[PDB]
Design a protein around this motif. Sequence first.
Motif, mmCIF file in Angstrom:
data_model
loop_
_atom_site.group_PDB
_atom_site.id
_atom_site.type_symbol
_atom_site.label_atom_id
_atom_site.label_comp_id
_atom_site.label_asym_id
_atom_site.label_seq_id
_atom_site.Cartn_x
_atom_site.Cartn_y
_atom_site.Cartn_z
ATOM 1 N N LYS A 1 59.240 50.350 52.711
ATOM 2 C CA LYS A 1 60.414 50.725 51.947
ATOM 3 C C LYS A 1 59.978 51.108 50.520
ATOM 4 O O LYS A 1 59.893 50.252 49.640
ATOM 5 C CB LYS A 1 61.394 49.550 51.932
ATOM 6 N N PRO A 2 59.753 52.405 50.292
ATOM 7 C CA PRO A 2 59.131 52.888 49.048
ATOM 8 C C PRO A 2 59.839 52.417 47.794
ATOM 9 O O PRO A 2 59.136 52.151 46.820
ATOM 10 C CB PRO A 2 59.210 54.410 49.178
ATOM 11 N N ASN B 1 63.117 54.444 54.015
ATOM 12 C CA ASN B 1 62.041 53.967 54.880
ATOM 13 C C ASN B 1 61.113 55.127 55.133
ATOM 14 O O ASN B 1 61.569 56.262 55.347
ATOM 15 C CB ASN B 1 62.555 53.448 56.219
ATOM 16 N N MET B 2 59.809 54.853 55.120
ATOM 17 C CA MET B 2 58.817 55.899 55.351
ATOM 18 C C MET B 2 57.681 55.353 56.217
ATOM 19 O O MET B 2 57.293 54.188 56.086
ATOM 20 C CB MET B 2 58.246 56.432 54.018
ATOM 21 N N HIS B 3 57.168 56.188 57.113
ATOM 22 C CA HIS B 3 56.029 55.823 57.951
ATOM 23 C C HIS B 3 54.766 56.362 57.274
ATOM 24 O O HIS B 3 54.833 57.335 56.530
ATOM 25 C CB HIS B 3 56.181 56.440 59.361
ATOM 26 N N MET B 4 53.616 55.758 57.570
ATOM 27 C CA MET B 4 52.358 56.261 57.056
ATOM 28 C C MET B 4 51.319 56.243 58.171
ATOM 29 O O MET B 4 51.392 55.438 59.091
ATOM 30 C CB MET B 4 51.920 55.437 55.809
ATOM 31 N N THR C 1 52.775 55.013 46.841
ATOM 32 C CA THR C 1 54.155 55.475 46.989
ATOM 33 C C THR C 1 55.145 54.313 47.137
ATOM 34 O O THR C 1 56.349 54.463 46.867
ATOM 35 C CB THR C 1 54.228 56.442 48.178
ATOM 36 N N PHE C 2 54.643 53.137 47.513
ATOM 37 C CA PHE C 2 55.502 52.007 47.817
ATOM 38 C C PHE C 2 55.497 50.992 46.660
ATOM 39 O O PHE C 2 55.119 49.832 46.812
ATOM 40 C CB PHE C 2 55.074 51.353 49.134
ATOM 41 N N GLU D 1 51.973 44.481 51.691
ATOM 42 C CA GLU D 1 51.912 44.434 50.229
ATOM 43 C C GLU D 1 53.318 44.437 49.651
ATOM 44 O O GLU D 1 54.222 45.066 50.195
ATOM 45 C CB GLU D 1 51.150 45.651 49.660
ATOM 46 N N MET D 2 53.481 43.767 48.526
ATOM 47 C CA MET D 2 54.654 43.954 47.685
ATOM 48 C C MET D 2 54.173 44.392 46.304
ATOM 49 O O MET D 2 53.197 43.850 45.770
ATOM 50 C CB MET D 2 55.421 42.649 47.582
#
Lengths: 222, 222
Positions: free
Chosen positions: A32-33, A7-10, A64-65, A211-212
């Motif tokens: 979730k990258p 998991n990453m925040h932006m 990145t994702f 987005e996916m």
Amino acid sequence: SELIKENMHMKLYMEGTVNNHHFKCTSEGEGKPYEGTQTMKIKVVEGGPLPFAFDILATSFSKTFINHTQGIPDFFKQSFPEGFTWERITTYEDGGVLTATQDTSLQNGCIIYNVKINGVNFPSNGSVMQKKTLGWEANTEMLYPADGGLRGHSQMALKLVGGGYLHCSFKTTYRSKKPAKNLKMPGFHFVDHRLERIKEADKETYVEQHEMAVAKYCDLPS
Amino acid sequence: SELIKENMHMKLYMEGTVNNHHFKCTSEGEGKPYEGTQTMKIKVVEGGPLPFAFDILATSFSKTFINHTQGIPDFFKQSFPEGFTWERITTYEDGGVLTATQDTSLQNGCIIYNVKINGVNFPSNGSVMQKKTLGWEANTEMLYPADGGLRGHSQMALKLVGGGYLHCSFKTTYRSKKPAKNLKMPGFHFVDHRLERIKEADKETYVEQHEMAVAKYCDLPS
């Protein structure tokens, strides 16, 4: 890509003009990258409410994702900790262009985006400036190595009120900030996309967008 | 569409110019219209061997052969017995465009193609005119209704000798020769496409080409 967690925040800062209307936005999000999913909460903080369709900014708010299938090497995740940049021009059918230049960095475990927007010549009484758009169909980006980075080409269709579409296409160059000796470059492949609006308030002063994205090769049966 | 059987034969006549080089081709083929598969055996019968890459003609040699999934109506099969036309312009990255106009009819149970080609401004020492190309990657066409028929938009990547790609895009309009009150029109969707060669000989004066095509919606969850 050990710096890129499950998991990453932006956080994002965007500034620019569309037909000489200046604006600024910020956003915050999480994703979730490795699963290729992400969501952003966006605010227009200057020049709101925007006097044009928010949809034209949607692809300027995150490579990145992307979920990588079929062993495809990940140009974006490999570029950390230095990160990468992208630069793009989108040309619309009825006259308008939107150009954007972006930097992607990593700071204290948070992915940071800085974006500048330059949109010109949208017809003053056309679908974009009169806000007659209803979001994007799905699409597939093609990516392959090029002039010092990865080259992307895309086409997309914007839904219109009344049931018609406004076509656009764009060309992107992605550039790693990491020395190239330390990158395993992918070959030609696709990123299968979808952009989903989650909500908006206050005439698109606040917008939530999801987005996916999945990297893959041609999916046709042998 | 019961004039369109589970197997159908095709015959084609093509004439035109590329950079003011005149040529003609003929072809014969067979496919399975509902399974979305087909094969065509193509001969250059005038102006050969062509002084340019055969690849720029490949998309000009058959929309009746698309597999329709997810209940998508079939603009093309519905058009018979009258049939339909298509018209297209492909723009190439390094200069050069390939314009084509086509008629599709059904005669004595055989599908018949008549094609006119007008290609201009390809760089004389470029990859196309110097025959330095190695065939197409896969792609997905976007199709939706437009004034007078169906509009398609596409992009394709052409492999190059020595590696790398030349990008092109095209816009097509498909027009039924059948009255429209008699058509169930599809909505926005995709045709997932792939072109391959089976064999070729003698500087592409004989080429046997195969296509698999499937109409579908976005294949991503949610």
